[PDB]
Design a binder for these strands. Structure first.
Length: 95
DNA sequence: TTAGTATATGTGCTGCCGAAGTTAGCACGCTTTCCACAAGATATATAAAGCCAAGAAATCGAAATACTTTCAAGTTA
């Protein structure tokens, strides 16, 4: 179980299944998507997840003890949104 | 035969609670059977329309996609 014996290189020249979908997506990207952008919500999620990576408290007494319950709670307050798009109305919190 | 005793003799006492009767003057005001006589419940046109419930077709309601708009960030300049 090492990395020196593990496959950067173009993922091709092997009998695969998902690689066909991957190449189709690459072609669809080269068609209209330009460089690496238009991923607004994607970068939002990325940064909002990185904001909580390895941040230490200002005081030593504010260290979260091991095993503390973290609960994810979505909230739907507003009516002003897409009732059509599967429903994505409002923010989600952690407590 | 006569004095002592038990009884009933009607009598006379006590309470016994109740009995009739009282309280003043106007103006307002259901069951068994048994029973018998006649009335369900019966075919049958019959024209007529209104009603009350299975089916068949129709269209309304709206849900999952297809167009256009719209930004917003990024391109040739």
């Amino acid at each position: 179980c090492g990395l020196d014996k593990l496959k950067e290189v173009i993922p091709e020249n092997t009998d695969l299944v998902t690689l066909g979908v991957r190449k189709r997506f690459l072609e669809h990207r080269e068609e209209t998507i330009t460089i690496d952008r238009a991923c607004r919500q994607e970068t939002f999620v990325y940064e909002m997840e990185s904001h909580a990576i390895g941040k230490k408290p200002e005081n030593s007494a504010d260290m979260i003890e091991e095993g503390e319950l973290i609960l994810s709670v979505n909230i739907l307050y507003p009516v002003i949104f897409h009732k059509h798009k599967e429903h994505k109305p409002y923010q989600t919190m952690l407590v």
